[model samples]
Target: MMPATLANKTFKLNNGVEIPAVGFGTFAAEGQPGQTYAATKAALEAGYRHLDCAWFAQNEDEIGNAIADFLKENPSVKREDLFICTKVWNHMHAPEDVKWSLDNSLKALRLDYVDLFLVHWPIAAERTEDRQVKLGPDGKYVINHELTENPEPTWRAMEELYEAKKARAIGVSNWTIDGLKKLFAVAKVKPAVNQIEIHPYLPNEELVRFCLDNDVLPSAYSPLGSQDQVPTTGERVRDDPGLNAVANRSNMTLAQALLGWGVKRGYVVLPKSSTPSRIKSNIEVPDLSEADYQDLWKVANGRKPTRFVDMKDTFGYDLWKESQLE
Candidate 1:
């Protein structure tokens, strides 16, 4: 069979860098070492040139190996053809710790540089098994809790990363409008993107608009609502009847419908899976009517918002919560 076409659209970052409109997510391969490696390799083979990896996922070795193998085999493909991404974990939130954690991740991934790097969250803290914060009686959230001038120290480090060419572009994840405003106030280099959760249950139109207005590309994760993909122990964003109804009436699956909604809103959506069939289906971009897009936003307002990867327990929660505009 002929190779699948690369995503047609591209977003220009503030620094004049361009990123593919869609990317392959590596979260599913995190738990299984061999499977993760194989799936990443398969994704590259199937025409995905952009790969997103995270330090918290703990599967850098597999992803790294897959990338190395792909590049070695396809020596003709330029290094710039692949838009690689890796994130700094919450454990290393301090400005100094950011570089330390990134060094470890790079060592594990065996990469001298990454194409894109993101701050995982607003605050730096760890999480527990039951998703609850473990705090002291003093009510202190871990880390240097110093919220003073230059609140963008961590972001400053991110700017340095871009200047040093460690990453061609830099961005933030799970940031609120207010948090971004603060970053903009002090940042020497503007963020190139903002990666956030977006699904039928929570469309995040406001956030998308905010990013676009600031020339920050919005990367949508969780394009497919929980449904049957994840195990029962995993947080499932129950299917929305409103969206399902639209899908059925329009001859689309729930996943396709939500992904279409993302495209209509001008955001890059990532639907992930280890299954070959699912992964293949995800790459097919859908065309949705403007009416359909509006319907999804209406549903988002009516239904309770569902956050698939909740991080309230992490030390970052307090900073995230307090930073939200009332």
Candidate 2:
């Protein structure tokens, strides 16, 4: 059963670490100058205990300061009270480079250890700057297909980090079902979570079920459809007629409907926003009834599921092959 309120809503990771359901996504905070700090600070003040950040975003310095200020102001709230998560980027997948990346991330976040550290993606790339990926003179990413397909090496290094107590839990992001199966064959410490893009349009049902069945938690990123990050030509999940109807019937806003649906389904829903009111309201997720939850089964009836945050063509690799989706 789902918790009645956000504070009481926590899921225990495979390793016994408790992560709050409603996490705050700090994906560069709309890529604005000062919005990362402001949004992170507001999310904390607004009662979000989980904050998901990434080294690739190149703005952990801002988030770190906000966390520091919040802790200083709210003396009663200790570091252990907050569930801080960050990721290792595509360029930092090598065994030797893994700790280097985590070192940099730790320095940027001003933390001795992160609550959870994730391998950002299954794909690996050549070394590049902190923010952007590198492209060859031909204007294509320098891909590492070997490590890309076989992430056991990367995950072994991540497991070492967990053993060293640098990360309480280790997981992956943007991983497909086959990719996860491959990892499990050699993984000593099974992955605790799979962070993926999910919304009404791209609920990723089969993959989510696979993870849940495997005792792996599936956490939702871009939970509010990542509307702000969608391409101009992409159809917004929020604007879907079926999802709109569900929201209308539930008497909740579009954002609330999607988040509530995700949380009630037992996945962590991360809704990113820099607006203070949004930061406050996003956590006020409503409970979904059996009827309201089952109504979403018709959301993608005969409609092609679309992904707003897509990178299928970026690495010259078919990241989301049809088999992977199933």
lDDT scores in order = 0.73, 0.85
lDDT of 2 by residue, 146-219 (tens): 88877788988999999999999999998889888998998999999999987777879999999999989999
| Worst lDDT 10-window in candidate 2 | 1-10
The whole-model C-alpha lDDT of candidate 2 against the native structure comes to 0.85
- By TM-score, who's the top model here? 2
Highest-lDDT candidate:
2
lDDT measured at residue 256 in model 1 versus the true structure, 0 to 100: 66
Question: Backbone clashes in each candidate structure, one number apiece?
Answer: 0, 0
What stretches of model 2 exceed 4 Å from their correct place? 1-4, 128-132, 228-234, 322-326
Model 2 residue 8 CA deviation in Å: 3.2
